[PDB]
Each structure stands twice: as C-alpha cells, then as structure tokens.
C-alpha cells in the first residue's frame, strides 16, 4: 500500500465532472475544480487544467496526471508549512501518508488548524490524538473516510485499507 493507492481508495476515479461530498465540482481522483455553483466555471477550470477543450470529460491518463500533480503539491505544501513540517518530520512512513491524505482533502490551512492533534502526533500519543481528531467537522461530515485516516494515525499500519 502507498499514498497513491490509499488516496485512490478514498477519492475514487470519475472521468466526468461530478459533485463532491460538499457539493463542489470535481473530477478525476478527487481533483477539486471550483467551489462555485456554476457548471460553466467548472468546465472552464477543467479546460485550463488539462490544456484542451474537454466538454467536461477526461481520459484516465489525464486523470492520473492531475493526481500525480496533486499528490506532489500536497507533499510540498506540507514541507513548506511551518506548522506542518515538524510534525511530518517526526512521523514514521505510514503515518506520514495519513497526514498527506488530510492535506490533499482539506488543504494546508485546514490541517494547520488541528493544533492540539498535531502537537499530540509530535509526542507519539496515538490514542489521544485519535480521539481529538474525531472531534471535528471533518469526522462528523465524512465519517467513513475520517475513520480510515484516523485508524492509520492510531496504529501506524494499513489495516483500515486492507
């Protein structure tokens, strides 16, 4: 199991524009297009992202290319974030993937907002951290995904994904 595989399981793959759990226009492997309500806006964004006129449909290759860029961006955001970096540096490989998953989903900023939890990860207090993480809009809106990531922080294995 690795980060790509993890995230493919969490986000799925769709080749046509769709609405994510929050209602935002999205495509491919969890690729957010725009927070706005306009389908036009979304098509526009897609065209600019792919560099071609798509009529809102993309190929699998095109889907993986966006995903690869999206995973690389998340890592780097983490790595360039004052709050995030120290935490990532402190974790083992499995637990690193779990933080990348959060960032991919909710952004650097959103994650940077889980102060208490983050401090707990830095001290290796896996159970206290899992409880704190669950106390969040994130856990209450998308519980099955959040359970996965959280168990991964708790145990440092891929069991939730297997």
Curated annotation (Swiss-Prot):
- EC category: hydrolase
Return the EC number: 3.2.1.17
* Catalytic residue list: 11 (proton donor/acceptor), 20 (proton donor/acceptor)
Q: Which GO terms describe its cellular component?
A: host cell cytoplasm
Q: Name one GO biological process term.
A: viral release from host cell by cytolysis
Where on this chain does substrate bind? 32, 104, 117, 132
pH dependence, entry free text: Optimum pH is 7.3.
- InterPro entries in the cross-refs: Endolysin_T4_type, Glyco_hydro_24, Lysozyme-like_dom_sf, Lysozyme_dom_sf, Phage_lysozyme-like, T4-type_lysozyme
Upon changing residue 26 to E, the result is:
Complete loss of activity at neutral pH; covalently bound substrate
KW Hydrolase (keyword) present: yes
Q: What is the effect of changing residue 132 to M/F?
A: 2-fold decrease in enzymatic activity
**Listed HAMAP family:** ENDOLYSIN_T4 (MF_04110)
What family does the database annotate?
A: Belongs to the glycosyl hydrolase 24 family.
Q: What is this protein's name?
A: Endolysin
Organism equals Enterobacteria phage T4
> What's the name of its gene?
E
